[PDB]
Amino acid sequence: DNSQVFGVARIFASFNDTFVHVTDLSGRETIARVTGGMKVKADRDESSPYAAMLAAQDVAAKCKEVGITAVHIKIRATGGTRSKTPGPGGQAALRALARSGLRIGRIEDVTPVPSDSTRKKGGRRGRRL
């Protein structure tokens, strides 16, 4: 316990436009919401790993500016009724937050899993791409 003031990065990684949003332990106080679509232009690449690194590096910079040094992780897919699977980008954001100075510990997944309700969007035959 060498005074690692803690944070929770709470990457929310969807199949498009992932999120990195570091807040206090209680989660009440936000620090650098800055997201995936913040730093990319295509709007198709919002989920791309490069968006993850860009968002992660800038939120890490803001993290050093404020003072937070150690971070716990709340990885979250879209969850609910949608696909239950972590977004492609968010993993790259995890890697970047690991790299850029920040100390990391206590990795957790908090994807909201339902207990079978709220009939999934799409109809019977479902998406028919």
Partner RNA sequence: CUCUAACUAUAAAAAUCUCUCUUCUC
Contact residues for RNA, defined by CB under 7 A:
88, 129
- Picked from RNA, other proteins, none, the partner binding residue 28 (CB below 5 to 8 A depending on kind) is other proteins
With a CB cutoff of 8 Å and minimum separation 6, the contacts of 114 are: 80, 81
Q: Which of 61, 64, 105, 114 binds other proteins (CB under 8 A)?
A: 105
Q: Give me the least distance between CB of 116 and RNA, in Å please.
A: 23
Site size toward other proteins, by CB under 8 A? 53
Residue 88's DSSP bridge partners are none
Q: Give me the least distance between CB of 25 and other proteins, in Å please.
A: 5
Site map for other proteins, 78-97, x if CB under 8 A? -----xxxx----x--xxx-
Closest CA to 63 of 108, 105, 25, 100: 100
DSSP 96: H
- Picked from other proteins, RNA, none, the partner binding residue 45 (CB below 5 to 8 A depending on kind) is none
Should residue 117 be labelled a site residue for other proteins when binding is judged by CB under 8 A? no
Concatenating the DSSP letter of every residue in 33-91 gives ---STTS-SSSSGGGSHHHHHHHHHHHHHHHHHHT--EEEEEEB-SBTTB--S--TTHH
The nearer residue to RNA, 80 or 88, going by C-beta atoms, is 88
